Amino acid sequence: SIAGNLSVTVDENLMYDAQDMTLTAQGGMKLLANAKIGLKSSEGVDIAQ
């Protein structure tokens, strides 16, 4: 439970692996990159609506 800003810096590949993910953010999420942002699924991707 970080009270201040949490900053993680990796100078090489970063790999997460989990059964289920929930990246809930009380604000704005900025997933910016320099190559293809390859969202992929075996069941499809939905939207908020």
Place this chain on the structure above:
Amino acid sequence: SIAGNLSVTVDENLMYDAQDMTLTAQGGMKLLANAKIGLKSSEGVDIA
């Protein structure tokens, strides 16, 4: 590595700075946000 479940809560802002980011979900991903979900690639954005 974690054997149970990972639960990280940040009161303030979160910044991750990596080179080759990749998250793998064996079930389903649930990206929830309150303001907006930016997706900038400067090369190309794919969704499925």
Place this chain on the structure above:
Amino acid sequence: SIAGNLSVTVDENLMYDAQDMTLTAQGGMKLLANAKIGLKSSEGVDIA
């Protein structure tokens, strides 16, 4: 701050909370899942 490869493995579900999430990758970002990837943005999604 990690100068090598940050690899985190969770057997169960992963929960992340934040105020203003920001993930940046100088290479390629990849999101993988086996179920639907939910984008539940309250206001909307931005793509550039």
Place this chain on the structure above:
Amino acid sequence: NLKGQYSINVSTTFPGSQASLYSAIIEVIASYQDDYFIFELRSRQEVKLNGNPPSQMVDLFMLRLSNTYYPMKLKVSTSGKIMEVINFTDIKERWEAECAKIVEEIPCIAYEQYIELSKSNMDTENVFLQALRKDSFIQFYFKEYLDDIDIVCYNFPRRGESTFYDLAIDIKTFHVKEYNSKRYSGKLICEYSEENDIFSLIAEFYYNTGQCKKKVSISVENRSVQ
């Protein structure tokens, strides 16, 4: 000299899950034409899964691939023994053209692997006839019920495992044999028309390991005898 439409229903109940139902209407126009008897298996319509038309892409792909067999020209001898399928080369060429057009439309490795795996089944007429038994209607309608019969439930316990049931002597009702009675159970009832022409048949089989169950029911709906 006879024809009609037969309703075929298959209900497979797995342990800890709801029943899965496949229902179809087979338009079959038999013809005496010696021991020759051509049935021609004219068409298969109203294919329903769990009471609803199929919607998954893989089930639709399987139906598209299997629509090439209909119409067959199965050479039933006297009671159901299919000696051969004379309309095989035409079926083979139709299925090859269908496979080519699905490959061109969707170059998917899953569909391609399915095609190669079925190629061995359809390579030879004898192999095609042997693998034709997997259909419930073909297995239960083209079968001699001589008081001692055997039926293969092709995915009875799980997907990809068969199970052999031997039925006893005892409107031509049978019953499952005595060995391993605590695991194998069920019955088979068959009711004929005035002259052969199987009118109804209900066969229930039970794998007691909860209790995997499979009930096959064939019924005559719009028959016509000349």
Place this chain on the structure above:
Amino acid sequence: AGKEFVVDKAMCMCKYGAAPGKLMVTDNQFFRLNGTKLCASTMTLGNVIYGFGICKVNPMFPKPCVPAITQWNGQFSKITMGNPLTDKSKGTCSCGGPDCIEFMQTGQIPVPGSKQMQQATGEHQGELDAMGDPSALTKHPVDTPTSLLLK
């Protein structure tokens, strides 16, 4: 504003044109939806079919329906990518006015996979496809046509 999104080479029908056409997107060259299919936004304006056969605003004086779409109505406003189109979207073509264009298909083809191969009702596969190896419905399909002759 619907249940899906419109991508490149999507089915498209104009109530004035003779034959249905195929959508063409060229402004958006970075955002893709289903594999390598570029998404269609409200910025896809003008000649976006390589046409709809022959235009029929005046039946006595027909001409090839070169599209001149100047407005898209029915977009999804929750993605500021311009906003993506939807199966309910309709164009203008500058010939038949609004609601002159219609989307027969969204242009997305759901190519299956190993998970979809497993999700199939394989217990009824012997009825759905008799010439079919159940191992093709597993994650790793291996061809084992082993025969045991009786001679």
Place this chain on the structure above:
Amino acid sequence: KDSTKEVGCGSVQYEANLKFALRVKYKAPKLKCKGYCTNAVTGEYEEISKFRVDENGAYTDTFYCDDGLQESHAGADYVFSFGINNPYGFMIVPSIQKIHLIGRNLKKPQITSVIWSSKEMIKFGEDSPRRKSINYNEDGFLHIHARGMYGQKVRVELFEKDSTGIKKLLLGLKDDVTILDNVVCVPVEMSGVYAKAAKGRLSFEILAKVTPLDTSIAAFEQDDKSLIELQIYGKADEAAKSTVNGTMKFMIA
């Protein structure tokens, strides 16, 4: 009771592609046989679904597998079940046959070939069409054909060969692949190897190295006869890629 003469009872080791027979003991009752093989990736037994008993004539105590067990399945454990009823699925055993497959006239299991193929589809017994030029956008297919190795865990690592003829470890996969039926296709995301080789430094001469986890079997190193060439200045148009998982959709929900 493996036959080919008449061999005694018990589990046996047989070479692939040999006409043999099975015998049973206790007129001509109804024998109902079943076939089981080990799943390559799981390692556990599974029924051979496309198992047919051709009826050339009346039933006999001996079953003839004249086609010979498949060379592609050299290294598997075929199992035959018999009986007057639903055959067993294997400890109550009196009527059961266990055969271990080995290569036909093959001294030891080995990697017979590794190539950079253009088509993702792969099958044992044929030379897959290999490619020479690929781009960073495309996804390469590495086709590994082995002899006598069925369902074998194997690591594969990608080397790069420079103008000086030195092969240096460029990349490696996080997971070990499984040779399924003496053949396997590995989809390699080629963008990673590019990024890495651009970090390390015309065209990029990418070679492959296949090492089984078993100590006895040697390793296969790719050479000039099969090495792929990454174009430093180029891109696919839309790009040979993998379709194992497929592209489903982007819907609204």
